[PDB]
Amino acid sequence: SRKTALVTGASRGIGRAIAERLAQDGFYVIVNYAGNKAHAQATVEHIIEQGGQASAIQADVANEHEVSRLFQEAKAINGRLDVVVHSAGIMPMAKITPESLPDFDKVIHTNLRGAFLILAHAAETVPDGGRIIALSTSVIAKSFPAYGPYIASKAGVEGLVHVLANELRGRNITVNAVAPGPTGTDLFYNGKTDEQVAAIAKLAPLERIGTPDEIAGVVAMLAGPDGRWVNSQVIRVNGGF
Amino acid sequence: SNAMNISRKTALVTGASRGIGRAIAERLAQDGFYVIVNYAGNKAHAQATVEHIIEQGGQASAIQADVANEHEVSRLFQEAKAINGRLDVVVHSAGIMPMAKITPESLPDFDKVIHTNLRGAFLILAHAAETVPDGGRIIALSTSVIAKSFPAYGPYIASKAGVEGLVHVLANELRGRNITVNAVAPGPTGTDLFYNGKTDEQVAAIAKLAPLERIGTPDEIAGVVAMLAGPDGRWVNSQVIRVNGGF
Amino acid sequence: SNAMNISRKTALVTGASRGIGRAIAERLAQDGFYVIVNYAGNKAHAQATVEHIIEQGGQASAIQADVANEHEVSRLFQEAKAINGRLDVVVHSAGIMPMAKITPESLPDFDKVIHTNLRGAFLILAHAAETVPDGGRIIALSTSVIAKSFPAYGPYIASKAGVEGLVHVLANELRGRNITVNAVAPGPTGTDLFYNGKTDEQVAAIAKLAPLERIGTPDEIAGVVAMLAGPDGRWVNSQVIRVNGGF
Amino acid sequence: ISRKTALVTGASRGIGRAIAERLAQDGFYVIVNYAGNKAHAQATVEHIIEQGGQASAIQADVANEHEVSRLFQEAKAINGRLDVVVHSAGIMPMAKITPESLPDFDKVIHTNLRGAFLILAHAAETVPDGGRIIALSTSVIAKSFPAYGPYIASKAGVEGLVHVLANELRGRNITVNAVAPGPTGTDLFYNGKTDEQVAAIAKLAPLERIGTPDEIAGVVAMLAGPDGRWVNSQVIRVNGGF
Question: Catalytic residue at D151?
Answer without folding.
Answer: yes
